[PDB]
């Protein structure tokens, strides 16, 4: 995407 | 014609007495002008939205909202990445910025995210973000 991992709140 | 930088600095100026719709709308217009505009717009929006100055952040959320309402794949896709979503999650999360962010700004972010889950179901990571926020108890 090149995306990063989702941060958990 | 000005840079995205100059336009966002107008559209989100803490000194603005009311929403500056000329500068907001012109920002949305300009971000699609060149190939790398949208990723820049989203970088710039993310910083403004994390302002400790509530009116700076609130105006920047109104920019975000406004540009999202209009047609544009590249910008829809940039906002629909965790690279940008994560900047929003940090504002509403008590383990990042959430503890010193006003509930006004936090609720606005939550309202917008919901609205995109419905209005833009193809941006699946926005729905993934919003379901995480429900599971962790932020929504509500």
The DSSP result for B68-94, as a single string, is HTS--HHHHHHHTSHHHHHHHHHHH-T
Selected residue of A3, A4, A7, A8 to mutate for chain B interface (largest B Cβ count, 10 A): A7
- Output the CA angle B73-B6-B23, nearest 5 degrees: 65
Which technique was the structure solved with, according to the deposited record? X-ray
Number of Cβ pairs < 8 A linking chain A and chain B: 37
The domains of chain B are located at: 1-140
Report the SS3 class of residue B3: coil
B61, two tokens? 């959320």
The CATH classification number of B1-140 equals 1.25.40.90
A4: DSSP letter: P
Task: Tell whether B89 lies on the interface with A, counting CB pairs under 8 A.
Answer: yes
End-to-end CA distance of chain B: 42
B28 close to B70: Cβ distance less than 8 angstroms:
yes
- Rg of chain B taking only CA atoms, in angstroms: 14
Selected residue of A1, A2, A8, A9 to mutate for chain B interface (largest B Cβ count, 10 A): A9
Question: How many whole angstroms separate alpha carbon B117 and alpha carbon B115?
Answer: 6
Residue B90's closest CA among B102, B106, B78?
Answer: B106
B79, two tokens? 């906002």
Which residue from A1, A8, A9 is facing B81, i.e. has the nearest CB? A1
Header resolution in angstroms:
2.0
Q: CB under 8 Å to B130, separation ≥6 — which residues?
A: B113, B114, B117, B139
Residue A4: its chain B contacts at CB < 8 A?
A: 81-83, 86
């Amino acid at each position: 995407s090149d995306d990063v991992p989702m941060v958990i709140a | 014609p000005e840079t995205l930088e100059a336009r966002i600095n107008r559209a989100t100026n803490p000194l603005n007495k009311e929403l500056d719709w000329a500068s907001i709308n012109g920002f949305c217009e300009q971000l699609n002008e060149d190939f790398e505009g949208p990723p820049l717009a989203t970088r710039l929006l993310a910083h403004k939205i994390q302002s400790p100055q509530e009116w700076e952040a609130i105006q920047a959320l109104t920019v975000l909202e406004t540009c999202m309402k209009s047609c544009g794949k590249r910008f829809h896709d940039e906002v629909g990445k965790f690279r940008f979503l994560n900047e929003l999650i940090k504002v509403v999360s008590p383990k990042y910025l959430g503890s010193r962010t006003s509930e006004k700004v936090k609720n606005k972010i939550l309202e917008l995210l919901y609205s995109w889950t419905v209005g833009l179901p193809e941006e699946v990571k926005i729905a993934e973000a919003y379901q995480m926020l429900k599971k962790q108890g932020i929504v509500k």
